[PDB]
Ligand binder design. Sequence first.
Ligand SMILES: [Ca+2]
Ligand code: NA
Length: 278
Amino acid sequence: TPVDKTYTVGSVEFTMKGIAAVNAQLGHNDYSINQPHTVSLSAYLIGETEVTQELWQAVMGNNPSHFNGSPAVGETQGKRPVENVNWYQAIAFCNKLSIKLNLEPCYTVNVGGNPVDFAALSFDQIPDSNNADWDKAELDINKKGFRLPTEAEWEWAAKGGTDDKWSGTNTEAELKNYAWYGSNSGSKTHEVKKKKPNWYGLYDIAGNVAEWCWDWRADIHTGDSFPQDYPGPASGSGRVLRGGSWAGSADYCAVGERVNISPGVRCSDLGFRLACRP
Ligand SMILES: [Ca+2]
Ligand code: NA
């Protein structure tokens, strides 16, 4: 298992949690579009928490979050997850974070044939609608920088070494102890790391905000096989997001429940969690 790592951007600290190489047993018979399948995964790290508003702002110099004020009693505003960021804006953050921390960026984007310099890139230059150039973003998974997890990486980490329906529990009854979801959120996001973690030490895998993943969505059917470190299909209409949110039913927060939307779309219940490799 890779050693956990804590990084600092200005005054903001964040932790990446080690996940051992594994033949990940993913999906479930009860999900027609996420049938049981195996993906061999290389060792990786995944964010202990969602990317918070203060981490987002430390890198990006703005805060587009819908819930940018009025935190719940006893909660710190800046430690709520960032949300209202689209998939393009998330990958741009990942590259800018890598650059700030002197790691090689995982992502390349060419705009009209010109490679995007992610250091120079201003926020307003990132698309807020479906954009063909950014849809062709290239992932080099062997660079040491930060990135979105693949869907397989996300689900394996979410499962936390167990076979439970949710991250940390197998009943909706106990879900309140692990997740901020439709029933207990009060219609808002919460400070990260306020509920129980899973056995891999990840917080808010279920609930709070859904989390952008790298992959285009394609249905995963009975008997399907996948290559090592599968990053999803080459094309699709929606990028995957996982884990459910403050707005979702308990079932929406299940570890195996697959959701996807146009990458240009952003909402108040959708943020992201980082991944990288040692
Ligand atoms: Ca979440
Ligand atoms: Na499952």
